[PDB]
Write an enzyme that holds these catalytic residues in place. Structure first.
Site, PDB file in Angstrom:
ATOM      1  N   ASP A  39       0.838  -1.204   0.142  1.00 25.17           N
ATOM      2  CA  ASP A  39       0.011  -0.032   0.204  1.00 25.17           C
ATOM      3  C   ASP A  39       0.717   1.319   0.161  1.00 25.17           C
ATOM      4  O   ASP A  39       1.724   1.393   0.790  1.00 25.17           O
ATOM      5  CB  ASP A  39      -0.792   0.050   1.124  1.00 25.17           C
ATOM      6  CG  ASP A  39      -1.909   0.995   1.298  1.00 25.17           C
ATOM      7  OD1 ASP A  39      -2.926   0.836   0.310  1.00 25.17           O
ATOM      8  OD2 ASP A  39      -2.096   1.993   1.982  1.00 25.17           O
ATOM      9  N   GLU A  89       2.282   0.151  -5.095  1.00 28.28           N
ATOM     10  CA  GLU A  89       1.646   1.430  -5.592  1.00 28.28           C
ATOM     11  C   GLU A  89       2.803   2.480  -5.494  1.00 28.28           C
ATOM     12  O   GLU A  89       3.444   3.027  -4.636  1.00 28.28           O
ATOM     13  CB  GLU A  89       0.506   2.228  -4.779  1.00 28.28           C
ATOM     14  CG  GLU A  89      -0.866   1.422  -4.911  1.00 28.28           C
ATOM     15  CD  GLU A  89      -1.827   2.104  -3.759  1.00 28.28           C
ATOM     16  OE1 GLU A  89      -2.678   2.635  -4.273  1.00 28.28           O
ATOM     17  OE2 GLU A  89      -1.483   1.992  -2.517  1.00 28.28           O
TER      18      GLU A  89
HETATM   19  O1  LIG Z   1      -6.377  11.032  -0.015  1.00 26.56           O
HETATM   20  C1  LIG Z   1      -7.285  11.411  -1.124  1.00 26.56           C
HETATM   21  C2  LIG Z   1      -7.597  10.140  -1.888  1.00 26.56           C
HETATM   22  O2  LIG Z   1      -7.288   8.788  -1.282  1.00 26.56           O
HETATM   23  C3  LIG Z   1      -7.642   7.681  -2.182  1.00 26.56           C
HETATM   24  O3  LIG Z   1      -7.572   7.835  -3.434  1.00 26.56           O
HETATM   25  C4  LIG Z   1      -6.472   6.766  -4.004  1.00 26.56           C
HETATM   26  C5  LIG Z   1      -7.081   6.445  -5.408  1.00 26.56           C
HETATM   27  O4  LIG Z   1      -8.292   5.910  -5.320  1.00 26.56           O
HETATM   28  C6  LIG Z   1      -6.052   5.489  -6.259  1.00 26.56           C
HETATM   29  O5  LIG Z   1      -6.580   5.071  -7.440  1.00 26.56           O
HETATM   30  C7  LIG Z   1      -4.526   6.083  -5.866  1.00 26.56           C
HETATM   31  O6  LIG Z   1      -4.497   7.305  -6.701  1.00 26.56           O
HETATM   32  C8  LIG Z   1      -3.347   7.329  -7.585  1.00 26.56           C
HETATM   33  C9  LIG Z   1      -3.712   6.949  -9.112  1.00 26.56           C
HETATM   34  O7  LIG Z   1      -4.206   5.597  -9.394  1.00 26.56           O
HETATM   35  C10 LIG Z   1      -2.833   7.200  -9.938  1.00 26.56           C
HETATM   36  O8  LIG Z   1      -3.011   7.087 -11.455  1.00 26.56           O
HETATM   37  C11 LIG Z   1      -2.099   8.709  -9.809  1.00 26.56           C
HETATM   38  O9  LIG Z   1      -3.423   9.676 -10.243  1.00 26.56           O
HETATM   39  C12 LIG Z   1      -2.956  10.797 -11.122  1.00 26.56           C
HETATM   40  C13 LIG Z   1      -4.019  10.631 -12.145  1.00 26.56           C
HETATM   41  O10 LIG Z   1      -3.702   9.633 -13.070  1.00 26.56           O
HETATM   42  C14 LIG Z   1      -3.904  11.887 -12.924  1.00 26.56           C
HETATM   43  O11 LIG Z   1      -5.031  11.831 -13.930  1.00 26.56           O
HETATM   44  C15 LIG Z   1      -4.244  13.162 -12.228  1.00 26.56           C
HETATM   45  O12 LIG Z   1      -5.637  13.028 -11.564  1.00 26.56           O
HETATM   46  C16 LIG Z   1      -6.163  14.214 -11.593  1.00 26.56           C
HETATM   47  C17 LIG Z   1      -7.619  13.802 -12.279  1.00 26.56           C
HETATM   48  O13 LIG Z   1      -7.197  13.255 -13.690  1.00 26.56           O
HETATM   49  C18 LIG Z   1      -8.681  14.963 -12.364  1.00 26.56           C
HETATM   50  O14 LIG Z   1      -9.886  14.476 -12.733  1.00 26.56           O
HETATM   51  C19 LIG Z   1      -8.784  15.427 -10.832  1.00 26.56           C
HETATM   52  O15 LIG Z   1      -9.569  14.774 -10.178  1.00 26.56           O
HETATM   53  O16 LIG Z   1      -7.623  15.834 -10.246  1.00 26.56           O
HETATM   54  C20 LIG Z   1      -6.645  14.809 -10.264  1.00 26.56           C
HETATM   55  C21 LIG Z   1      -5.341  14.977  -9.326  1.00 26.56           C
HETATM   56  O17 LIG Z   1      -4.945  16.297  -9.836  1.00 26.56           O
HETATM   57  O18 LIG Z   1      -3.173  13.051 -10.882  1.00 26.56           O
HETATM   58  C22 LIG Z   1      -3.334  12.006 -10.522  1.00 26.56           C
HETATM   59  C23 LIG Z   1      -2.309  12.351  -8.702  1.00 26.56           C
HETATM   60  O19 LIG Z   1      -0.950  12.398  -9.373  1.00 26.56           O
HETATM   61  O20 LIG Z   1      -1.835   9.101  -8.505  1.00 26.56           O
HETATM   62  C24 LIG Z   1      -2.702   8.725  -7.681  1.00 26.56           C
HETATM   63  C25 LIG Z   1      -2.289   8.896  -5.991  1.00 26.56           C
HETATM   64  O21 LIG Z   1      -1.828  10.260  -5.840  1.00 26.56           O
HETATM   65  O22 LIG Z   1      -4.138   6.215  -4.736  1.00 26.56           O
HETATM   66  C26 LIG Z   1      -5.134   7.509  -4.214  1.00 26.56           C
HETATM   67  C27 LIG Z   1      -4.299   7.680  -2.768  1.00 26.56           C
HETATM   68  O23 LIG Z   1      -4.478   6.368  -1.794  1.00 26.56           O
HETATM   69  C28 LIG Z   1      -9.173   7.700  -1.970  1.00 26.56           C
HETATM   70  O24 LIG Z   1      -9.659   6.607  -2.665  1.00 26.56           O
HETATM   71  C29 LIG Z   1      -9.766   9.041  -2.577  1.00 26.56           C
HETATM   72  O25 LIG Z   1     -11.278   8.785  -2.268  1.00 26.56           O
HETATM   73  C30 LIG Z   1      -9.570  10.261  -1.878  1.00 26.56           C
HETATM   74  O26 LIG Z   1      -9.708  11.168  -2.399  1.00 26.56           O
END
Ligand SMILES: OC[C@H]1O[C@H](O[C@H]2[C@H](O)[C@@H](O)[C@@H](O[C@H]3[C@H](O)[C@@H](O)[C@@H](O[C@H]4[C@H](O)[C@@H](O)[C@@H](O[C@H]5[C@H](O)[C@@H](O)[C@@H](O)O[C@@H]5CO)O[C@@H]4CO)O[C@@H]3CO)O[C@@H]2CO)[C@H](O)[C@@H](O)[C@@H]1O
Ligand SMILES: [Ca+2]
Length: 760
Positions: free
Chosen positions: A355, A384
């Site tokens: 995790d 992750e």
């Molecule tokens: O603590 C807050 C959060 O915690 C938990 O979230 C977890 C996610 O469910 C889990 O998938 C994972 O998140 C990762 C993600 O999988 C990974 O891809 C990366 O995310 C990137 C995106 O790929 C990228 O697109 C961008 O995301 C944007 C998004 O597109 C836009 O629509 C908007 O929502 O803003 C987002 C963020 O700027 O950037 C992200 C982040 O770099 O990294 C993620 C981890 O940072 O892990 C999460 C953390 O445990 C809970 O499930 C959730 O409910 C909470 O809100």
């Protein structure tokens, strides 16, 4: 972001590590019949008191305080090593205990600024109900029958895996699982052989289902002891369990009895043994990155040592859960590595999923890899490669090396046998996990093609988003427990149907996802039930949602038997063709992509040149996300006699037909997998599975109302067909030709549902 910041807290902790780091290997309880020894590491403490009890909680019958004892400073040549110890003479097994620790924080050692905290042992191996009192146990008494003959189940190569990510409650909470009333949603569900849907004896569920599906590996969601289920409460409670309380104790709620500390240990071991007896590797979800709260055994023993502290005194909140474990500290590093070794040795665990591994430092991760290698290098590690917030850490570790977080960006510094979830292929396949409505390749996104194409070589060939060192360092997946299920994202992003409703086009997209996962390099991974179109009714964060929303709907092994069969077949293809399961980069330059890997396209195609004697010589793979059939001409013309082994209908090891030349007709929203005819003949790789073809025909005209589907399974195993769920309600089944239910035979059987006019 992560920030290197040194402050009074980090300096104090570093000085503690230099003087007091302890590698004695005997913290916690050392039990024998003749005496029990207790050891607590606390350089900040002015005193530690041991409290003995007859029961884990005060409400239980026979509950009482036995006595308290003063621990003494452990001296080595008259010098304190930071450890507290006492030895109680006699027989003390099955008594419960806590410590009362009188202590300063790390920045006020030697002061009179003390508080006293009551806590369970940091090194608990057993607790009573809700993890508040430790238990003294003879661990040999917790071993189930045959446990001494239970061996690790290890993959020769991590990249030969097929991983099923499973929650213990989800596995069997559904009454339709055919699991006994007592064991539904429990550790012991795994020990029940011969389970069938609704116990009707026609089609396998649970462990028998997993044997038939052929998954190599089950990854279990948290079964260390977490906070978020009241173990004395209602059976309807649900949590994923990402809320750690006791790292080296099994969760109580999955046992038949959480009050007696030994029962959950025995039953947890029985689960693991049953998976091993089924020939399945067991991977454990571990969460060292944070604890449920800072009102923890760690904070109550050595305040501000075990968590990352900001200069302002706030706990760094890189987990988004209120704290982060300081892996860079000598005694938390040691705790984590010792913990991993304990789960492997004591519980026969075969690997780990970390995790928020991005919160763990690279040096600790690599040292953990080396530690587990001394047991067996086939023990798997992945995690992750990201965090859940900003992380504040010291410049250097307790070893004096520069701190690096174990993120995707730092893949090159991490062991190539610590793999990282590939969100590149995940998002490429089905759209952004962050937005259930977002489309990826399978739903028709051309811009998503590059995510898939980089994913095909496990993001280890070239750089898109991040770069794995090798396929061994990549987990290949389209969905996990987090965010939406694959089928829920398909439905949400298309509007094709309601959540959990079968739709023929949605199912095509689901089959295409299958083809991609099992024609890509890296460690193939699925959410448990992805193969049967699992839904969470659109819930994109189901961590504390209803147990009956979360549970695997076992009816889906019938309602989507064709899809299960497709996955089953694709798994066979990957395990038959060595380039797909390569650990290293040997095969990177053996791929010929028809279009540029970066191409915006509706058709991705490539060939792979093999070098393993007795295998197929060359494979052609085509993904078509168009709403029409496409004619795809390979750029690689070196082979012009092909045998098709996967199409829109079925996947497996049998010839589905032949192709002469370099051009393939690929149906809408489907894949083709083909291999060289010469190699197909010479290799003698063939299916031992049998097939059932299900047709849906309008009786009056003889015309099909819906595309036929193929079920596929072991000869002599049971199958159940059903009428097509998508045929309009203005038709009803009037007659069935063939056996709607039966056993697979080597020769293909046909079932035809004949339909007549109806008004519902
Ligand atoms: O603590 C807050 C959060 O915690 C938990 O979230 C977890 C996610 O469910 C889990 O998938 C994972 O998140 C990762 C993600 O999988 C990974 O891809 C990366 O995310 C990137 C995106 O790929 C990228 O697109 C961008 O995301 C944007 C998004 O597109 C836009 O629509 C908007 O929502 O803003 C987002 C963020 O700027 O950037 C992200 C982040 O770099 O990294 C993620 C981890 O940072 O892990 C999460 C953390 O445990 C809970 O499930 C959730 O409910 C909470 O809100
Ligand atoms: Ca618990």
């Amino acid at each position: 972001s992560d920030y290197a910041r040194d402050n009074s807290y980090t300096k104090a902790a570093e000085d503690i590590d230099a003087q007091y780091a302890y590698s004695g290997n005997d913290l916690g309880v050392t039990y024998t019949k003749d005496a029990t020894t207790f050891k607590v590491w606390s350089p900040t403490a002015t005193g530690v008191k041991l409290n003995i009890f007859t029961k884990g909680s005060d409400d239980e019958q026979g509950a009482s305080k036995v006595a308290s004892y003063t621990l003494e400073k452990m001296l080595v040549d008259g010098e304190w090593n930071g450890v507290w110890t006492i030895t109680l003479v006699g027989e003390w097994k099955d008594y419960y205990y806590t410590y009362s620790v009188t202590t300063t924080d790390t920045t006020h050692i030697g002061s009179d600024a003390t508080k006293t905290y009551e806590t369970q042992d940091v090194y608990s191996t057993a607790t009573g109900v809700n993890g508040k009192r430790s238990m003294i146990v003879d661990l040999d008494e917790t071993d189930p029958e045959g446990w001494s003959n239970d061996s690790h189940v290890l993959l020769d190569k991590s990249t030969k895996s097929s991983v099923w990510e499973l929650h213990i409650k989800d596995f069997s909470y559904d009454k339709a699982s055919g699991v006994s009333d007592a064991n539904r949603g429990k550790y012991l569900a795994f020990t029940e052989n011969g389970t069938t849907l609704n116990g009707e004896g026609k089609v396998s569920t649970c462990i028998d289902y997993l044997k038939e599906l052929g998954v190599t590996t089950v990854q279990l969601n948290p079964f260390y002891d977490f906070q978020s289920v009241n173990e004395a409460g209602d059976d309807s409670q649900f949590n994923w369990g990402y809320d750690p309380v006791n790292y080296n104790v099994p969760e109580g709620s999955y046992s038949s009895n959480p009050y007696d500390g030994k029962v959950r240990i025995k039953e947890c071991k029985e689960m693991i043994k049953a998976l091993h007896d089924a020939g399945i590797s067991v991977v454990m979800d571990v969460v060292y990155n944070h604890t449920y709260s800072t009102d923890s055994c760690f904070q109550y023993t050595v305040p501000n040592y075990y968590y990352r502290m900001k200069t302002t005194g706030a706990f760094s909140d890189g987990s988004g859960c209120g704290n982060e474990g300081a892996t860079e500290r000598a005694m938390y590093r040691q705790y984590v590595i010792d913990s991993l070794k304990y789960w492997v040795n004591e519980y026969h665990v075969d690997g780990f999923r970390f995790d928020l591994m991005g919160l763990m430092d690279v040096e600790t991760m690599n040292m953990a890899r080396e530690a587990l290698d001394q047991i067996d290098p086939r023990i798997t590690m992945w995690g992750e490669g990201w965090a859940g917030g900003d992380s504040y850490h010291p410049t250097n570790t307790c070893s004096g090396t520069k701190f690096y977080p174990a993120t995707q960006a730092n893949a090159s510094r991490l062991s190539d046998r610590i793999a990282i979830f590939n969100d590149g292929i995940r998002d490429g396949i089905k759209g952004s996990a962050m937005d259930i409505s977002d489309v990826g390749f399978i739903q028709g996104s051309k811009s998503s093609a590059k995510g898939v194409s980089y994913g095909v070589r496990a993001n280890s060939s070239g750089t898109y988003k991040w770069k794995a060192q090798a396929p061994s360092q990549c987990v290949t997946y389209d969905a996990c427990h987090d965010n939406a299920t694959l089928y829920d994202q398909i439905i949400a992003s298309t509007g094709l149907a309601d959540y959990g409703e079968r739709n023929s086009e949605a199912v095509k997209m689901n089959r295409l996802a299958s083809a991609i996962i099992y024609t890509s390099q890296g460690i193939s991974f699925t959410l448990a039930g992805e193969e049967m179109a699992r839904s969470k009714d659109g819930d994109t964060n189901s961590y504390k949602s209803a147990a009956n929303l979360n549970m695997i709907k076992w009816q889906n092994v019938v309602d989507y038997a064709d899809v299960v069969s497709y996955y089953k077949g694709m798994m066979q293809i990957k395990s038959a063709f060595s380039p797909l399961t390569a650990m290293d980069n040997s095969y990177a330059d053996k791929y010929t992509f028809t279009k540029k890997v970066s191409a915006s396209t509706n058709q991705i195609s490539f060939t792979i040149q093999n070098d393993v004697e007795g295998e197929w010589n060359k494979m052609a793979v085509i993904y078509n996300n168009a709403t029409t059939a496409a004619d795809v001409t390979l750029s690689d013309t070196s082979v012009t006699d092909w045998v098709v082994i996967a199409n829109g209908e079925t996947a497996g090891l049998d010839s589905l037909g032949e192709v002469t030349g370099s051009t393939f007709t690929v149906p809408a929203r489907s894949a083709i997998v083909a291999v060289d005819k010469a190699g197909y003949e010479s290799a003698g790789i063939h299916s031992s599975k049998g097939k059932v073809k299900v047709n849906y025909v309008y009786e009056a005209t003889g015309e099909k109302l819906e595309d036929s589907v193929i079920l596929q399974g072991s000869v002599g195993s049971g199958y159940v067909t059903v009428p097509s769920a998508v045929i309009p309600d203005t038709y009803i089944v009037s007659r069935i030709g063939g056996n709607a239910e039966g056993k697979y035979t080597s020769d293909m059987q046909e079932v035809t549902y004949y339909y007549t006019d109806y008004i519902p």
